[PDB]
Amino acid sequence: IVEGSDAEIGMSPWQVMLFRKSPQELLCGASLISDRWVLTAAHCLLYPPWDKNFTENDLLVRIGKHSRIEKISMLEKIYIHPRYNWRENLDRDIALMKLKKPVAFSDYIHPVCLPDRETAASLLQAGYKGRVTGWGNLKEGQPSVLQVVNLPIVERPVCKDSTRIRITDNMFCAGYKPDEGKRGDACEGDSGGPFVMKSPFNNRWYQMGIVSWGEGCDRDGKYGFYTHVFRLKKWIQKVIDQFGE
C-alpha cells in the first residue's frame, strides 16, 4: 500500500495473507467470506506467462494477523474462475480457496459480506470511496503493520482513457485524479486483497473489489483496477453450492 496508514487492531478482521508454503514467502492478500472460504485474485495462483501455477498443497493462509491470535490454515482446494483471462487483461481475476478446517471467529477474525444488487447499485458510484488493505510494498518496502488506504471509485471513461489495456465489465478502477491533491494506491504484494465499502443502510462492510492490477503504483494519471466482485457473484455462489461443506 502506497500513501496509506497503519491499521487499527481488528479494523479489517477479514484480512487474509496468502503464503507460499515452501519456501515460505508472502504472495498476496485475500479475504475471509465464511469460516471455510477465502477470496483472492486468480493471478495470485495462476499466471502462465510467469510459469505460475500454485495449487492447494503449495499454499497456506494466515488469518487474523496485524503485526509481522493469528491462525495458520491449510487449503483443501482452490478454484479459479474458468473464464479467467490471463492472456489479455486479467478479465475475471478471481479465485476461491477452501480451508481444510473451519477457522474460529474471534475479535480479530470475522468475515466480510458479499454485495447484493441494491448495495452494489447504491455504493459502486464514481467518487464514492472504498478501503484497500494489504502487506505490499510502500513504494513502486514491506511494512511492520497492515496498511490501509481509502480511495474513490473513478468514472469508467476516465479509467479507460488511462490505460491501453482493454477494460471489461468485470473491472472497475479507483484512486485519486492528478488534480485532487490526495494520493494512494495498491502496490506489489497487495494483489488479491479486498476493496471494501461500509453500507449506510445496515452498518455492514461489503467487499466490492479485489486488488487486480495497475501500471506502476500511485502514478499521476494511473489508477488501480479491481475485480468487480458483484458481477461475478453467481460464479462464487456456484462454487460454494457445489463444493461447500
Binding site: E8, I33, H110, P111, L114, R131, N150, K198, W205
Partner: peptide, 30 residues
Amino acid sequence: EADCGLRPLFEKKSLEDKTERELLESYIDG
C-alpha cells in the same frame, strides 16, 4: 455468513475506526 461485515471491535461495540467517516462523507457529500 449471517453475521458478516460487523466487526467485533467496532460495529459490535458501537465504536468507529479512525477513517470510516471519510467513506460515509464521500457517499453523502457533493
